[PDB]
Amino acid sequence: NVFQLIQTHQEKAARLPPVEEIRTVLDQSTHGMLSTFSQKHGGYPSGSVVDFACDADGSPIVAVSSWAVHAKDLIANPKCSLLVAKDPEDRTDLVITLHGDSIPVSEKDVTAVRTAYLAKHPGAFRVDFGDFQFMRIEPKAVQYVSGVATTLFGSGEFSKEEYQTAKVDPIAQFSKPVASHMNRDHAEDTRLIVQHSTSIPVDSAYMLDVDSLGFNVKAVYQGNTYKLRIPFPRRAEERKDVKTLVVEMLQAAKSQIKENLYFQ
Amino acid sequence: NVFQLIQTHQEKAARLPPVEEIRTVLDQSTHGMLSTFSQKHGGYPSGSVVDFACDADGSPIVAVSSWAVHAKDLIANPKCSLLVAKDPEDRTDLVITLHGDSIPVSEKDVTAVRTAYLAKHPGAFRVDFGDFQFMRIEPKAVQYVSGVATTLFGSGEFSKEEYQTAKVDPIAQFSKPVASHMNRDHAEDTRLIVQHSTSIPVDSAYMLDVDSLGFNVKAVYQGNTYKLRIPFPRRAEERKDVKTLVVEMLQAAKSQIKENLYFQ
Ligand code: NI
Ligand code: NI
Ligand code: NI
Ligand code: NI
Fold first, then answer.
1. B152 vs A178, B145, B146, CA distance in Å?
2. Where are the domains of chain A?
3. Known SUPFAM superfamilies for this protein (chains A, B) (predicted)?
4. Which residues of A touch B48 (CB under 8 A)?
């Protein structure tokens, strides 16, 4: 395993600041693991898998059925936690915990909240949203742990005010269409860019997520899978800048290969 | 989507009884989401991702660090829940919740428990297991919900005694080597078997898990991904019977294709 050899470079690779990384990942996430605690449940705290959509302040909105085992606890027992694992398998990868208080969405805000929720679960309400109670989890504390995004600096916490005032990275929303496209039509271009960036001649590089400062890949080299941070040459300021920076990176990789051949 | 068309057949497909399915899935699982509750944490219940290994009675053994944010709660606050999602993404797939009480593993049992834990996380103790406290989660209740394995009958619960007296399916332990092999060397054979079994001419079928009564696939047909239950012609009684039954299924698929061609 040669990840240990580029540990230092990977540590230095341009990334969002932690609070913006946590704000962005939560904003882009659609499901997580809710921990609740109710009277009438033997004194056992409970876990459930829930869908949610962050509102503009980063408060998860959950559509809670009174029939949903454990998740129904939110109705009446406001204190909860929501756990979001950027990649559920990878135990070195970023895990975010939000402690907060579930607040019913007031009649006035239902339409505005229902709209916002559908802009992350397109294909809900297929029967009826009248079968559910919209709850907003107002955060009290946001904690994270990581061995991939960062190990030494891979733990931290934020107040409600720090989290709420953090900006969602405006490029991150284009992750699935950009990655989709690269991985379908340009997989060998991602491979060449990753080799140039990291100096590991990877078998393959599958693009995972993008932000204004670069993109993350899952790469394979000699049997082993590596999560790698691939920084852009400079910050992307608009959606169009992502293609420009990817092409520039590919041209720089190809230039390096040609010059090396000139020098034998 | 043509899954709705084979709903009835898929409901009837031979499967383990629910308590044996839950006992087996938990026995074969290596990580889950722990819900804990501590004093000195604002009255917020907390979630964490933990590794575990079920003991022979099906009690999850967890190696708990006093430094692990939230999971350290187990040390001192025995009442917890462990959530295991057979496939974390798929919100129709089986989700198991165990409510139980964390009990420290006595000095006497440490070696016997440490051994048992390593037989599910081979490559722990790489530094030291002296850095951790082994806790056993004694179950009080085991609950499940499913939309794949079963929807109408896709919810239930078991007592400690019902869960503990259930048998782990003895073929399930061979899931990863059998699936590995089929998916690497015999993927088109899995495809043909799935088409014969379900009458959907699937693009591909990736074998997921096996038990004494059959195997589960993730299949693709015209853009859409389907989880399908593929029952054996009869129960497998030993590891060797799995290859025999798979070959028999492939021969039956090929015979059906030939006879159809004889009849034009
Ligand atoms: Ni319960
Ligand atoms: Ni293109
Ligand atoms: Ni906390
Ligand atoms: Ni073979």
1. 39, 10, 9
2. 17-165, 172-263
3. FMN-binding split barrel
4. 83, 95, 97
As a whole number of angstroms, the distance between CA A212 and CA A81 comes to 29
Smallest CA-to-CA distance from A98 within A153, A66, A61, A134 is with A61
For residue B46, the chain A residues in CB contact (below 8 A) are 35, 45, 81, 97, 99
Q: Which CATH code is given to the segment(s) A17-165?
A: 2.30.110.10
Structure-token match 């001192």, residue found: B76
Using only C-alpha atoms, chain B has a radius of gyration, in whole angstroms, of 21
Q: Do A91 and B49 touch (CB under 8 A)?
A: yes
CB contact under 8 A, B49 and A155: no
Task: State in Å: Cα A179 to ligand 2 middle.
Answer: 11
Q: How was this structure determined?
A: X-ray
Q: Is A48 left (phi over 0), alpha (psi -120 to 50) or beta?
A: beta
Q: Give Cβ neighbours of residue A142 (< 8 Å, ≥ 6 apart).
A: A22, A26, A96, A97, A98, A99, A157, A158, A162, A163
Cα–Cα distance, B14 to B144 (Å, whole number): 19
Buried b (16+ CB within 10 A) or exposed e, A188-205: ebbbbbbbbbbebebebb
As assigned by CATH, the class of the B172-263 domain is alpha beta
Within chain B, strands assigned E span 31-36, 46-51, 53-54, 60-64, 79-85, 95-104, 133-145, 155-159, 204-211, 214-221, 224-231
> Is B108 within 8 Å of B92 (Cβ atoms)?
no
Closest residue of B to A37, CA-based?
B45
Distinct helix (H) and strand (E) counts, chain A = 7, 11
Nearest to B83 among A37, A47, A141 (CB): A47
| String of DSSP letters for B242-254 | HHHHHHHHHHHHH
